[PDB]
Every structure is written in structure tokens, then in C-alpha cells.
Amino acid sequence: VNSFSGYLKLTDNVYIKNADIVEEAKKVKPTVVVNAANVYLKHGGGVAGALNKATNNAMQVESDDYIATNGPLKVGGSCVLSGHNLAKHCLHVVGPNVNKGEDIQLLKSAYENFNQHEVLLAPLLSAGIFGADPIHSLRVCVDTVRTNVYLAVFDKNLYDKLVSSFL
Ligand SMILES: OCc1nc2ccccc2[nH]1
């Protein structure tokens, strides 16, 4: 038994809720929150800017030091950093950005990062401003992630479409 409340169960291991991933993290303080990162860990908007704003920019300060030491992530890759006031840890995962021409096949590689963590609070990778079809992202998530994932879908309209079209 864990502290996640109000989720619809899609599969043995995948759960979904209409919620802002930021308010959910503040309430639950999960072990792992996933950020929809880019390779530069430049958290300007979407999930990353909203998460970073909730940390009062501490996420960006830590991320800049990480990049200065290690260089950019790979598309499909990840790193583990602090969760600040939101979670124990933040798993920064880079899904392909369709609005930059990145191979959508890299979405499965991105979701494979989640398998290194027993339980995660996450957004749909490559959705929102990353330009992928969220229905596709949920299918890849279900078919790739074997650990327990709690998906926060910010848009109520999209949430209802994801549930009602789920196979
Ligand atoms: O704080 C406004 C907000 N923008 C968001 C974008 C993506 C996910 C959650 C968000 N919350």
C-alpha cells in the first residue's frame, strides 16, 4: 500500500489521474517524480518549468551544475537529481521532441528509464509541448514500464480521452 489517491487503474502496474503533477508531488512527496526534461536540463516551461518554479529555481541551479560537469543528456536518456521540496528524487527523462524532429522510436527508450525505480509519479513523456500524440505515449508507457507508475494528466479533456480510448 502507498500514498497515491484517486487514480484509475489501467493495468497491473499503470495508474492515471487528472491532476497537475506539481500539486500531486507537493501532496504525496513521492520517492521519485519524473520531469519531462530536455537534454540541456533547461526547465523553461511545461512539466519542467512548472516543477522548477515550484522549487523556487533550485532544480535549475542543481541542473546547471550537473550539465557543467557531465554535458547534455541523450534523447531517450535520464539522470537522477534531487526532488527538492517535491519528492526524494527527480528522475529527469528526455523524451523525443517532435517539434524538433526527434525519432519517436526513442519514446520507448525514454520510458525504459522508469524500470530502474519501483514506484514513480510521472507525466506522459513527449506529450504537451514535446508534440507527440498522448494516446501513443500512454500505449508505449503501458507496453514498456513494468514498475508501478502513477501518471498525472494535467488536461481534464485529454484525461477523459485517454481513459475512454484506452485498449
Ligand atoms: O503551474 C502551471 C502548470 N503548468 C504545467 C504544465 C505541465 C504540467 C503541469 C503544469 N502546471
Q: What is the dihedral of CA 158, 159, 165, 167, to 10 degrees?
A: 140
Q: How far apart are CA 43 and CA 37, in angstroms?
A: 7
Resolution of the experimental structure, in angstroms: 1.0
Ligand 1 in contact with 47 (CB < 6 A)?
yes
How many other CB atoms sit within 10 Å of the CB of residue 147? 14
Task: List, in order, residues 6 or more apart from 138 with CB less than 8 Å away.
Answer: 10, 16, 124, 151, 162, 166
Nine-digit cell at 44? Answer: 523553461
- Name the residue with the closest Cα to ligand 1, atom 2: 50
Q: What was the structure determination method?
A: X-ray
- Name the residue with the closest Cα to ligand 1, atom 11: 50
Q: How far does residue 120's CA lie from ligand 1's centre (Å)? A: 18
Q: How far apart are CA 95 and CA 103, in angstroms?
A: 10
Do residues 56 and 113 touch, judged by C-beta distance below 8 A?
no
Q: How far apart are CA 59 and CA 146, in angstroms?
A: 27
